[PDB]
Amino acid sequence: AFTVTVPKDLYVVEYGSNMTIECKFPVEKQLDLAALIVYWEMEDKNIIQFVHGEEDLKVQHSSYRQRARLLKDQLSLGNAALQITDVKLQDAGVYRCMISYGGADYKRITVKVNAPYAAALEHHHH
C-alpha cells in the first residue's frame, strides 16, 4: 500500500523568509528515477512538475516562477522537498504533493504566513 507521509502538516513562516515543505515516499535503497512523478500545487496552481528525472518548468504558475524548486538531492532519501524563496502573503494556503512511484498518493500541507503591516497593507490593496 503506497503511502505518502508528511513530517509536518502545518508550517508558519515569516514574510520574506525561505521555506522548505516536505513530503516523504518509500524508496527501498535505490531510486528508480524513470518511475517517479512528483507534482506540487496550491489552489490548483502548478508549482513543480518532476517527470522523467527532470523538472518541467514550462507550465509552472507565474506566481512561483524563479522562486520554487524541488530539492533533487533529497529524492534518493524518499523526500520530495519543495523550497520556496522569498515567501509572500499569497503563498499562504493549502499545498498538495502528489507522488507516483509505482503506487500513487497525495498529502496536504497548510502554510500560514506572518507579515508586518507594510507588507500586509500592500497585499490588502493589491
DSSP the chain: ----B-S-SEEEEETTS-EEEEEE----SS--GGG-EEEEEETTEEEEEEETTEE--TT--GGGTTTEEE-GGGGGGTEEEEEESS--GGG-EEEEEEEEESEEEEEEEEEEEE--HHHHHHHHH-
Name the minimum Å distance from CB 86 to a copy of itself. Answer: 28
Of 27-35, 45-53, 65-73, 86-94: span binding ligand A1IZJ (CB under 6 A): 45-53
Out of 10, 12, 35, 37, point to the residue binding ligand A1IZJ (CB under 6 A). Answer: 37
Give Cα separations from 42 to 89, 106, 114 (angstroms): 13, 13, 18
Name the minimum Å distance from CB 37 to a copy of itself. Answer: 5
Of 61-69, 80-88, 96-104, 111-119: span binding a copy of itself (CB under 8 A): 96-104
Of 12-20, 24-32, 76-84, 103-111: span binding a copy of itself (CB under 8 A): 103-111
Please give the residue ranges that form the binding site for a copy of itself (CB under 8 A): 37, 39, 44, 51, 98, 100, 103-104, 106, 108
Residues that bind ligand A1IZJ (CB under 6 A): 3, 37, 39, 46, 49, 51, 59, 98-100, 104-107
